[PDB]
Amino acid sequence: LQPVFTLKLRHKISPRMVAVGRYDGTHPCLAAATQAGKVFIHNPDVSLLNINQTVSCLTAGVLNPELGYDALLVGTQTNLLAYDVYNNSDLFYREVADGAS
């Protein structure tokens, strides 16, 4: 086939940490880990989120079906954070102590 779209993002993406989520409710965006423990969000501009901690997991889905927004999840070897990027507010910041592999 042919790549229907292409783009170059200046940030190194951590391999197994990538997700696509409609963080605006109806506007899908890309969430991907990076060096220094920061998670970037590509809207269609790149916006950084300071996890300030080495990420080890990352996904995005519907965690409360009452609303139609995707929740950005970020796992760390000692923490786990759900994030409503639209209205920046922690859905839950749990401390696992078992890790997020």
């Binding site: 423990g37 300030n52 901690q53 080495t54 760390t76 070897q77 000692t78 923490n79």
Partner: peptide
């Protein structure tokens, strides 16, 4: 300081 505040070793 960021490496210090973090729990995980590195």
């Amino acid at each position: 300081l960021t490496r210090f505040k973090d729990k995980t070793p590195a």
